[PDB]
Specification:
Chain lengths: 50, 49
């Protein structure tokens, strides 16, 4: 431990949150709204037959 | 099939609706806002030139 000493690799808390530039694209992308709840979200037809 | 309700299978939940109702109101009315008004007492009216 005489060389690398940048906080003992405590990174990924800031300057490294690049996930934001992927979230931005996910929002401004033309992906569908696929789901499994039959688009109702409140089926509850005798204890969620699904 | 009630079993292992974990992972987003839970009954009796709130929905978090929107407290507002978005609706368009194209109420410009450019012509009637300038035409004018005048009372009349008969269903038929007329003018002359």
């Amino acid at each position: 431990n005489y060389g690398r000493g940048r906080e003992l690799m405590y990174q990924l808390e800031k300057k490294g949150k690049e996930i934001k530039r992927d979230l931005e694209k996910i929002l401004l992308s033309g992906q569908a709204r696929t789901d499994v709840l039959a688009d109702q979200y409140l089926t509850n037809s005798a204890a969620d037959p699904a | 099939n009630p079993t292992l309700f974990v992972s987003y299978d839970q009954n009796g939940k709130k929905l978090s609706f929107a407290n507002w109702i978005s609706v368009l109101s194209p109420q410009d009315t450019p012509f009637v806002s300038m035409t004018g008004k005048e009372s009349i007492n008969q269903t038929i009216f007329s003018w002359q030139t």
